[PDB]
Ligand SMILES: *[C@@H]1O[C@H](CO)[C@@H](O[C@@H]2O[C@H](CO)[C@@H](O[C@@H]3O[C@H](CO[C@H]4O[C@H](CO[C@H]5O[C@H](CO)[C@@H](O)[C@H](O)[C@@H]5O[C@H]5O[C@H](CO)[C@@H](O)[C@H](O)[C@@H]5O)[C@@H](O)[C@H](O[C@H]5O[C@H](CO)[C@@H](O)[C@H](O)[C@@H]5O)[C@@H]4O)[C@@H](O)[C@H](O[C@H]4O[C@H](CO)[C@@H](O)[C@H](O)[C@@H]4O)[C@@H]3O)[C@H](O)[C@H]2NC(C)=O)[C@H](O)[C@H]1NC(C)=O
Ligand SMILES: *[C@@H]1O[C@H](CO)[C@@H](O[C@@H]2O[C@H](CO)[C@@H](O)[C@H](O)[C@H]2NC(C)=O)[C@H](O)[C@H]1NC(C)=O
Ligand SMILES: *[C@@H]1O[C@H](CO)[C@@H](O[C@@H]2O[C@H](CO)[C@@H](O)[C@H](O)[C@H]2NC(C)=O)[C@H](O)[C@H]1NC(C)=O
Ligand SMILES: *[C@@H]1O[C@H](CO)[C@@H](O[C@@H]2O[C@H](CO)[C@@H](O)[C@H](O)[C@H]2NC(C)=O)[C@H](O)[C@H]1NC(C)=O
Ligand SMILES: *[C@@H]1O[C@H](CO)[C@@H](O[C@@H]2O[C@H](CO)[C@@H](O)[C@H](O)[C@H]2NC(C)=O)[C@H](O)[C@H]1NC(C)=O
Ligand SMILES: *[C@@H]1O[C@H](CO)[C@@H](O)[C@H](O)[C@H]1NC(C)=O
Ligand SMILES: *[C@@H]1O[C@H](CO)[C@@H](O)[C@H](O)[C@H]1NC(C)=O
């Protein structure tokens with residue numbers, strides 16, 4: 001069904017869907033709710049409706065995502081990470097800032113504090129931008145006929161890399177092993193790191209009467 | 223001032239743009255806003271009225287893992303051509319209609335400044351820009367532009383600055399075109415593909431001479447010294463070189479030394495520098511900035527300091543972190559003008575000694591994540607420090623008594639060290655905003671003298687020491703702590719009394735203290751924004767049913783291993799960990815139903831709870847581990863227990879009972895018939911993993 005709690009989730013087979021209202025206090029008079037629609041094989045479909053207004057209009061309110069569960073392995077031993085994601089978005093009125101992005105967290109050990117974050121931004125609506133120390137892209141890389149600009153930034157004690165798409169990608173199909181291999185070869189990512197989390201979801205800033213529907217989502221680690 | 227034509231033109235330009243974050247709100251046709259000069263971004267002339275500056279530029283504000291900019295979306299109207307005397311035009315961060323640069327910009331006939339950098343312009347650069355004869359500053363960097371012909375540059379004979387970074391650069395003869403600008407000083411060509419387009423010696427020979435000062439050549443896959451050698455045709459006038467993120471794999475070029483007037487060298491984020499600064503340095507004499515971060519230098523630190531000996535009186539910032547440097551930090555105060563020094567995450571196995579007395583101007587220092595030994599130096603030799611991080615080292619000895627002479631310190635982190643004691647001067651800091659001395663072997667007792675004058679302390683972290691904290695009665699604390707982290711610290715036989723005047727604190731970890739007193743009456747209400755409450759392994763007694771009032775920020779409640787008694791406290795609507803084992807509670811737990819709870823871990827084992835389990839567990843589907851063992855429950859189990867699809871553990875033994883995937887463990891011993899969960903929202907966006915080493 002549909003659940004509106006702050007930390008509530010739905011654990012299905014080989015998938016977990018969160019609401020993650022982790023910064024709801026930064027805004028006033030907002031709400032959000034996520035729900036799963038159909039699960040079949042390795043494909044999951046879901047939706048997320050929200051309405052956030054006012055408050056700190058320059059902060060992420062939530063990261064309602066659909067994460068994958070897998071046996072943690074080092075980046076060396078990962079052969080391929082196939083992924084697909086088809087989504088549609090429906091906002092209304094004006095002053096709409098949001099984001100759609102993959103998040104991959106890697107650390108030194110199997111269960112450790114997140115040392116490296118890799119975000120893949122398939123859409124940047126209304127001024128949403130990645131973390132960047134200099135505010136400027138540091139690499140331009142093409143993976144599978146998809147262009148990306150790479151940003152590097154600090155998050156406490158974590159290094160965040162960001163691949164922002166040059167154009168909006170509403171239908172994505174790729175192998176994320178290429179991104180990690182590029183990062184290890186050029187950007188200095190250690191190859192012995194353990195990939196602990198892989199997920200994808202939205203990140204609203206300010207939006208009224210908004211709803212995002214993921215018609216299909218798949219991921220695996222080989 | 224404010225001739226009506228300019229006001230009409232500016233209003234027409236406003237009409238096209240679609241502002242959404244309050245910008246341009248000062249503009250309007252209302253009689254109250256008639257005067258043009260007072261508008262934001264509009265500057266006029268004193269004698270005449272035609273405006274001189276139009277600076278509608280924005281800035282980035284950044285959060286945990288995102289940044290935002292109030293970009294102006296709209297159409298750039300041609301009515302700006304009514305600005306016949308304009309010379310400043312800065313529309314940088316706004317994203318307009320993501321199309322080609324407007325052509326009418328070439329017809330301003332008085333422009334002297336133009337900054338369209340970091341907008342979302344695309345397409346070819348307009349060819350009419352040859353009409354901008356009077357331009358001096360031109361910034362068009364980091365847009366999705368395509369540049370393959372630079373024939374328009376030859377007619378622009380007044381530039382002192384040209385930024386063309388972040389473009390699909392394909393001009394094979396760019397050096398010849400750039401050289402045609404006699405007065406060029408600073409050149410920005412970062413993020414271009416300059417690796418594929420290296421100038422030839424013949425065309426460098428067939429060129430004029432122009433005195434460049436600052437070079438910003440970053441984000442090109444150079445990877446060798448043979449692809450950027452051309453910049454050594456500028457040794458006479460070079461003053462700043464920025465060569466970061468170039469995947470350089472080799473020795474730093476020896477010709478970087480002997481570059482007179484050099485003041486800013488950036489070589490951060492390379493592949494392998496293989497020895498760091500060579501012997502060619504020490505001839506610099508004017509260096510003021512040197513960033514060699516994350517480059518795998520593998521250099522001996524005293525060798526680097528002796529090779530940087532030329533710029534002792536001028537070097538200000540020295541970033542040398544995320545490298546692999548070994549040795550001992552000796553004689554750092556001989557650098558008169560040093561203000562920042564970063565040496566995080568190295569293989570420094572040495573000492574931190576001064577061995578001679580001279581003051582230092584360092585304001586920022588961090589030596590964390592190393593293997594440094596020995597005692598701390600006389601910290602009174604660093605009077606102007608503002609931050610000081612020395613965590614994860616092997617430092618020993620007491621903190622020197624001069625620590626109280628800083629008078630400007632804001633952060634002091636000495637965690638994960640083998641420090642033995644704390645001095646009495648710690649109170650006289652008066653501007654410390656955070657103090658972390660956790661995981662040290664700290665002995666002795668801390669009286670109020672150590673805390674006498676910290677009127678700005680917000681963070682107190684003395685976790686896991688042999689320390690003691692006894693403050694005299696009738697003491698009025700001068701600080702309002704927001705995080706209180708004092709585990710395994712002897713806070714006294716009685717409940718601490720300095721907590722009465724403490725408000726507005728987010729977490730409270732006073733567990734493993736030796737409190738042997740009942741809950742005081744004055745401790746009746748926690749602050750509204752309380753987040754973490756841990757009172758485990760104490761001897762506190764009383765009733766907590768009147769202490770938890772369902773705040774909206776609760777995440778962790780740990781009142782285990784105490785002498786609490788009474789009805790079960792109200793469970794917060796957003797709590798996640800709820801540990802209450804080893805106490806003396808009693809009664810039914812029917813009050814776990816009236817509100818929806820997002821708890822992921824609750825433990826009620828080793829109490830005297832009796833009665834029947836409520837058939838209301840559908841209201842808490844977030845449960846992972848459930849423990850009701852060693853209690854005195856009775857009656858049939860609720861069928862709603864089958865609705866906890868997220869359960870991973872269910873311990874119910876030593877009871878009097880009668881009568882869901884991922885349930886790894888199912889213990890139902892007696893009753894007459896390592897696991898790891900996730901607490902999300904701990905480190906802001908990041909989650910935290912909690913391991914439950916449950917018994918069997
Ligand atoms: C055309 O228009 C465009 C508009 O887009 C213009 O572009 C803008 O131009 C302005 C200037 O006009 C720029 O503003 C300036 O920014 C700089 C940079 O600030 C950022 O970096 C700081 C330093 O970072 C190092 O240090 C920090 C820790 O201190 C560390 O975390 C970093 O990772 C980094 O560390 C690296 O270096 C170390 C030392 O070498 C190494 O050890 C280490 O290993 C690394 O290698 C940083 O401090 C600063 O922090 C700010 O932001 C964070 C996050 O938001 C915030 O938390 C902080 O509180 C700070 O607010 C930034 O990250 C900045 O130094 C300049 O400061 C001047 O102005 C202030 C104003 O008060 C003065 O006080 C200063 O003394 C100084 O004079 C200035 O703000 C802007 O960045 C730039 N933007 C873009 C997108 O281009 C363009 O210039 C225009 N062109 C023309 C011709 O006009
Ligand atoms: C404000 O307007 C005055 C008047 O035009 C400008 O002063 C003129 O400047 C030009 C160029 O230097 C001279 O040829 C004129 O002789 C000056 N006028 C007078 C009366 O002497 C002035 O420069 C303008 N302000 C700015 C900032 O440009
Ligand atoms: C630093 O500059 C000096 C000059 O001030 C360089 O000295 C030259 O090279 C050697 C040095 O052993 C000697 O022949 C002379 O001192 C100089 N040669 C002349 C004048 O022809 C010195 O080489 C520079 N440092 C480095 C590492 O090259
Ligand atoms: C805590 O520090 C403050 C700093 O303002 C001290 O307040 C004054 O300090 C000056 C010295 O700079 C003395 O001349 C004043 O007599 C102090 N005023 C008061 C009311 O004490 C303050 O004294 C310090 N705390 C203690 C206990 O000395
Ligand atoms: C589960 O939680 C809901 C909501 O917290 C409870 O709903 C309450 O039901 C009673 C009896 O019908 C009403 O008097 C209250 O007004 C309801 N509260 C709200 C907030 O709607 C419900 O009783 C709980 N238990 C079960 C088994 O559903
Ligand atoms: C550029 O200058 C030339 C030379 O006077 C002139 O003929 C042309 O009209 C100018 N361009 C524009 C757009 O005014
Ligand atoms: C070499 O320089 C001369 C300077 O007079 C110039 O005329 C000539 O065009 C240059 N050679 C080439 C190939 O451009």
Ligand SMILES: *[C@@H]1O[C@H](CO)[C@@H](O)[C@H](O)[C@H]1NC(C)=O
Nearest residue numbers: 422423426427452454455456
């Ligand atoms: C410029 O560098 C080249 C290197 O190929 C050199 O031949 C030439 O003499 C230099 N010109 C100077 C230093 O004026």
Ligand SMILES: *[C@@H]1O[C@H](CO)[C@@H](O)[C@H](O)[C@H]1NC(C)=O
Nearest residue numbers: 702703704725726727728751
């Ligand atoms: C209360 O704490 C907050 C930090 O969350 C701080 O911003 C605020 O200034 C504090 N107020 C007082 C009166 O200490």
Ligand SMILES: *[C@@H]1O[C@H](CO)[C@@H](O)[C@H](O)[C@H]1NC(C)=O
Nearest residue numbers: 709733734756758778780799
């Ligand atoms: C509470 O503190 C004790 C010791 O100080 C620790 O073992 C326990 O894990 C803490 N509670 C939580 C929820 O982490």
Ligand SMILES: *[C@@H]1O[C@H](CO)[C@@H](O)[C@H](O)[C@H]1NC(C)=O
Nearest residue numbers: 712715734735736737738759
């Ligand atoms: C403090 O508590 C510890 C552990 O319970 C105990 O060993 C020690 O004797 C106590 N100290 C005093 C002074 O009672």
Ligand SMILES: *[C@@H]1O[C@H](CO)[C@@H](O)[C@H](O)[C@H]1NC(C)=O
Nearest residue numbers: 738761763784785804805806
């Ligand atoms: C608290 O309980 C423990 C064991 O249940 C007991 O040994 C101790 O005496 C109790 N404390 C008091 C003050 O009675």
Ligand SMILES: *[C@@H]1O[C@H](CO)[C@@H](O)[C@H](O)[C@H]1NC(C)=O
Nearest residue numbers: 830832853854855856877878
């Ligand atoms: C525990 O429950 C039993 C019956 O199941 C009964 O003796 C009484 O209610 C309780 N006794 C004690 C000692 O707690």
